[PDB]
Amino acid sequence: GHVGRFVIWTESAFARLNDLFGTWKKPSTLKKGYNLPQPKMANTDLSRLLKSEEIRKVLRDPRKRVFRSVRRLNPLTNVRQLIKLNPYAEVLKRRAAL
Amino acid sequence: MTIRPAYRPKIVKKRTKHFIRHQSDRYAKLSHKWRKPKGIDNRVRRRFKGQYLMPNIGYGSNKRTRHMLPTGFKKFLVHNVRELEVLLMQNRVYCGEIAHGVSSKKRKEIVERAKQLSVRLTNPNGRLRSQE
Amino acid sequence: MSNIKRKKTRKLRGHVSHGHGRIGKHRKHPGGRGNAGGMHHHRINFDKYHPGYFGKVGMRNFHLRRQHKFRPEINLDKLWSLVGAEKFAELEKEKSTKAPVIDLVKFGYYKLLGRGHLPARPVIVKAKYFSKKAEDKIKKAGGVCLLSA
Amino acid sequence: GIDINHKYDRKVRRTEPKSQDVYLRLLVKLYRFLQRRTNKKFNRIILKRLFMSKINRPPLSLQRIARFFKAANQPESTIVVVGTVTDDARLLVVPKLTVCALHVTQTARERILKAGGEVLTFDQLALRSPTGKNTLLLQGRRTARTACKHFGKAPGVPHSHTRPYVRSKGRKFERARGRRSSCGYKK
RNA sequence: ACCUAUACAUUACCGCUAAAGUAGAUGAUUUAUAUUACUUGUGAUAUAAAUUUUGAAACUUUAGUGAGUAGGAAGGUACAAUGGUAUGCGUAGAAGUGUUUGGCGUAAGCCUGCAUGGAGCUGCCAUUGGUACAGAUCUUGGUGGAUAGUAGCAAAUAAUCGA
RNA sequence: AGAUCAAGGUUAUGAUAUAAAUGUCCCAGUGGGCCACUUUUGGUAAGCAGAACUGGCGCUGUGGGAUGAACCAAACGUAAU
RNA sequence: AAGUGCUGAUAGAUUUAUAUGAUUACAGUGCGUUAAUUUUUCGGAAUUAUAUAAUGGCAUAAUUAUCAUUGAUUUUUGUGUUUAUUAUAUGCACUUGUAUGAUUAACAAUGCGAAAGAUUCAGGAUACCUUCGGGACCCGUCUUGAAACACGGACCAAGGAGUCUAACAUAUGUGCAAGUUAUUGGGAUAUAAACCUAAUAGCGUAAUUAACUUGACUAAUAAUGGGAUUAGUUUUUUAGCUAU
RNA sequence: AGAGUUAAACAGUACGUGAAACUGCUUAGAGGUUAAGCCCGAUGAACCUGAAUAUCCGUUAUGGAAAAUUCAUCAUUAAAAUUGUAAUAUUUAAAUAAUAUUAUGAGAAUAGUGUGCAUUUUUUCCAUAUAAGGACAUUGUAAUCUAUUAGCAUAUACCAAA
């Protein structure tokens, strides 16, 4: 089930494969009505498909940070979050403590 | 002499003890290797108090330190020499154990070759045998 | 020859009652063997899902022979794929030295029906039969539906 | 504690092609990238339709390639079909059109090329119209097929018309009691 | 006041579920410095050093969340064979078996040392089967307690001496 | 009762969305239930018999009631506080 | 209600942030107007105008709208007024500074992976023995309910039970597509394989009647013709957005 | 029981392996409570597994040796590729493309020769300077965040209660 045995063609062997499975242009003569199967993807190179300059004039958003940064502090014991969150509340600290 | 890897973590563990299969104390036919009981009036399946404990995924170890050995390394069964050349630049996450099939003749080379690539073999002094 | 891991028995083994129940065990034949009884204890199953079982509509033909109803069929829908479409372009210049000659019984067909909506060229159709709309919708285009022998 | 999340919080869909086809499982690899970096909805419905079975990618004859195209005003809109384009002999003269398809029957490749236009795999589409400008993305009927004719059946309602699982068409095959008002009843 | 749950809460970890991000690497990015356009000022160029693959079936980010018979679905795992493969292992010791050898796995399981053994065996990719046992008064062989010496060796009159 | 025009402000209670909508396989099992508040019929009563509603047990561990299938708290990934 | 002013303790601290993406925006320190005022004299210290809409305060106009209306409450504000309050007007360098990337790290002590040789500190219900505490009924089964005064089971090794087939139906995979399908046969031939292949034949392509009859849209064109609800491609002009 | 034979008698006619069930013997510790077993936390004994080197307020300051070089400011020379141009032939009339040949050019690349070619270069080992030659682990310590628990209490404002 494993494709690709190492193979050796002779000369007149190799010159008959354009008859057995005929060609891309015309069908075959030695297999009546046979027609070579067409792939679902003819160009099949992704790294040149994605390369590409026909596609990278469309692409929008290369989101380049990660933005994890998560921990919830406490704005009732950590004063430095009070003045980040309610900035006016810094004043009332320096007013009544004054 | 091999430095333990890649600035080692602290391997911590939910249970060390292994799970030991209902009624295996009672019978010599039952192996201690766990079976889930399926049977209806069973207090172990039902998870009664002070019966024992079943497996689940909740005891699953940290995904960093999963399969890590005591030495911070992870195993890699080596079976001949040119499997050690796989560990030429994995000698910093993995470690080799020479198989049980590998004979005393070849092990002397695997031990000497793996001393050059600095890997930490987990069983040298196997088939020593300071003999013929 | 069938991949067994996807069969349930690899998986149900072993929990006890193998998928079939503790209460209502997998017994031998708990409803009847076969189409028993589609007229008493399976009747709901037999009407729905098969209305029309259990009767006789009738005309008995002792030893039907399957040649006296042979009559293969063709609509006007094809009729012109039987000549080449590459032989349709030339009569579509327009230039009518034609109708063509189609001999539908030499192909395999007898009855020429009329589904169709065929083009404005004439045709000459030698088939053994007719529809009412096969005769009209050809002779409107000029040609003639003609009797094969 | 909370009551609840029951089910199905597990939403229901298919998320990779079940074809192990090495050509299809590469056009997916591409079209993942053409819809996460160009957020078109045109390109979702190609990644979504590269996933489905062969039911859900039903054939679409050469005449509906053409019968839809001639609904006009887009004379260079390529016809995008995630599936098969077969051939209609009941169409005689075929217009010159450009076709994107997974598979094209050769009796339709011999005709479209002769007209002559193009036949495109889905990688030549994306290297030409990555955002899908000037394309016509069609699909043939999913319930065209005759397995679907039998769904679902109470004889007793005035609307079923849904096709039993007989073995054979004739009299003395489910045609008597419960279908005719003489024998039994009319369903 | 205080004690008390597998509940509540904040944290670590496992899974699930739901979202979200990454693939121009004859590219991207640093740090300096030479030059520089110079826009005051900041970019572009040269040099020197540096970082920058992932079974994309992968990696990264985020949040919620976990009862279960009967029952269904997924993913693993043991057994044995076939077709390919591992330039596999093996009388310098295969299978098996034992074992306070040492670990791995959440588990099924698995690797390894020593012991015995004495000729074959395995990993992977396919496809398959006479494919996993605690039960069935299951089958067939073996063995325990009882009892390893207990019930018992009591009808038919009876033997004893010395050689 | 309809088919096309013309005019229309700010879309017409509240609070919700652990996604909803829809096919197929009507696929597995099930088609012996018991318990309880309030309602209730037969019986003299019954841990009896039979129904209506809601919740449970069945399938369910943990905390409490010394004890317990259903009571009262509470529903259960491995751990610390 | 305010931080008012703290003092005590507890447990915990993900992170290979490139083992395929900011360590930078913040603020905080150390150099470059002024002048008197004050205080200690060794610092500090204080001071105005410096530009606000000014927000709060006062007076007044003004109007929206109202508990109750003598009034009060407003509302849109607007002006004047001074009483205060707040923010903006800190670049260039430079730190071992704070924050923020699930915010744990600075100081010491103890001890040398130590050539073979070999200790220290932590850990090991691995699989047992010793010592205590807590919990803890026997499994399988049928059952509404089993530890049951329900049935089977003394113990152990081997064996041991959802399969082949036939015909359908659905789902998925694959090939070809109005077709498709060698396989009964034949031919080539390398060997019960593979290959090649004529005439059919099934199934599909057209149906409905008990039957004989009959046989699918106005038309050279048309997806339930027509209608709604339509993903999507084309398209409209409009400010308009990044570049221009 | 010695001895002998064999590679082996732990292959001596249960004749390969030799499992379990059950057990005689040795060694170890222990015994009046769920009958014993068992779960979880610890324990004594025993055995065992794992453990670390380029820095504070740096992969910085600085002196010794050795060898040597396609390295220099090196220079020629010989290749073989790479990359990018151009040309021919294969091509689906053309182009594109793709292959294969031909040729240009740059920088690189080895190998050989080469101011001084060891002049201060160049690859490798040694000196002293700030915290210290650690870099780790096990700990007492310290302050920080999260969740929390107990504690003292500067001060306003409110309603009648005089």
Determine if strand F comes within 7 Å of the CB of C20: yes
Query: What's the CA A94/C1' G51 distance, rounded, in angstroms?
Result: 25
User: Are C124 and C142 spatial neighbours (Cβ–Cβ below 8 Å)?
Assistant: no
Angle (CA) A70 A72 A78, round 5°: 130
Q: Which nucleotide is nearest to C30 (CA to C1')?
A: F31
> DSSP state, B83?
G
Cα(C41)–Cα(C130) distance, integer angstroms: 51
Q: What is the SS3 assignment for chain D?
A: CCCCCCCCCCCCCCCCCCCCCCCHHHHHHHHHHHHHCCCCHHHHHHHCCCCCCCCCCCCCCHHHHHHHHCCCCCCCCEEEEEEEECCCCCCCCCCCCEEEEEEECHHHHHHHHHHCCEEECHHHHHCCCCCCCCEEEECCCCCCCCHHHHCCCCCCCCCCCCCCCCCCCCCCCCCCECCCCCCCCCC
b/e burial code for range D102-117 (CB count within 10 A of at least 16 → b): bbbbeebbebbeeeeb
Say if C15 is an interface residue toward chain B (CB within 8 Å): yes
Separation of alpha carbons D104 and D114, rounded Å: 14
| Set of chain D residues whose Cβ sits within 8 Å of the Cβ of A56 | none
Helix residue spans in chain C (DSSP H) = 43-46, 104-107, 132-139
Residues of D numbered 89-108 whose beta carbons fall under 8 angstroms of chain C's beta carbons: which are they?
89-90, 92-93
Cα–Cα dist C47/C69, whole Å: 32
Note the resolution in Å, 1 decimal: 3.5
Mark yes or no for CB contact C15/B38 under 8 Å.
yes
CA of A43: which chain D residue's CA is closest?
D123
Q: Do A42 and D131 touch (CB under 8 A)?
A: no
Do the Cβ atoms of D184 and C54 come within 8 Å? yes
Q: Which nucleotides of G are covered by protein (CB under 7 A)?
A: 2-5, 15-16, 19, 21-22, 85-87, 99-103, 113-114, 116, 124-128, 134-137, 139-144, 146-147, 155-157, 162-165, 168-179, 195-198, 205-206, 208, 210-212, 214-217, 219-224, 231-234
**Alpha-carbon distance values, A68 to A75, B63, B74 (Å):** 20, 20, 30
Q: How many residues does chain C have?
A: 149
CB contact under 8 A, A60 and D38: yes
Question: C78 vs D89: CB contact, 8 Å cut-off?
Answer: yes
- Are D89 and C81 in contact by the 8 Å Cβ rule? The answer is yes
Report how far residue A94's alpha carbon sits from residue A90's, in angstroms, rounded to the nearest whole number: 6
Q: How far is the CA of D88 from the C1' of G194 (A)?
A: 37
Is D107 part of the contact surface with chain A (CB cutoff 8 Å)? Answer: no
Tokens representing D120?
A: 């495109």
CB D114 within 8 A of CB D93: no
Contact call for A40 and D121, based on CB within 8 A? yes
Cα D16 to Cα A42, A92, B122, D31, D44, distances in angstroms: 21, 58, 41, 12, 13
**Cα angle C53-C56-C62, degrees, rounded to a multiple of 5:** 120
Substitution target from D63, D90, D162, D165 for chain C, most C beta carbons within 10 A: D90
| DSSP letter assigned to residue B111 | H
Residue B55 host element (H or E): none
Euclidean distance between CA atoms C45 and C36, whole angstroms: 11
For chain A, list residues whose CB is within 8 angstroms of any CB belonging to chain D.
Answer: 35, 38-44, 46, 49-50, 52, 54-55, 58-62
Is residue B78 helix, strand or coil? strand
Chains that touch A (3 or more CB pairs under 8 A): D
Q: Is chain A in touch with chain B: ≥3 Cβ pairs within 8 A?
A: no
Residues of C in contact with D89 (CB under 8 A): 78, 81, 85
Instruction: At A62, list the tokens.
Output: 């290369």
CB-count burial class (<10 Å; 0-12, 13-18, 19+) for D44: middle
B26 touches strand H (CB under 7 A): yes
Question: How many Å lie between the alpha carbon of D22 and the closest alpha carbon of chain C?
Answer: 23
C-alpha to C-alpha distances, B72 to B18, B67, C49, C120, nearest whole angstrom = 21, 9, 66, 86
The contacts found for B69-72 with CB under 8 angstroms, 24 or more apart, are B69/B95, B69/B122, B70/B11, B71/B4, B71/B95, B71/B120, B71/B122, B72/B4, B72/B5, B72/B6, B72/B8, B72/B9, B72/B11
List the structure tokens of B22. Answer: 């209902």
Burial B31-50 (b: 16+ CB within 10 A, else e): eeeeeeeeeeeeebeeeeee
- Give the distance, in angstroms, between residue B37 CA and nucleotide F27 C1': 27
Measured between CB atoms, which of C57, C89, C119 is closest to D175? Answer: C57
Angle between helices D62-69 and D106-115 (to 10 degrees): 40
Per-residue flag: B13 CB under 7 A of strand H:
no
Distance D174 CA to E129 C1' (A): 43
Tell me which chain C residues have a C-beta less than 8 angstroms from the C-beta of D187: 47, 51-52
Nucleic chain H contacts, protein chain A, residues 27-86, CB cut-off 7 A: 71-74, 77-78, 81
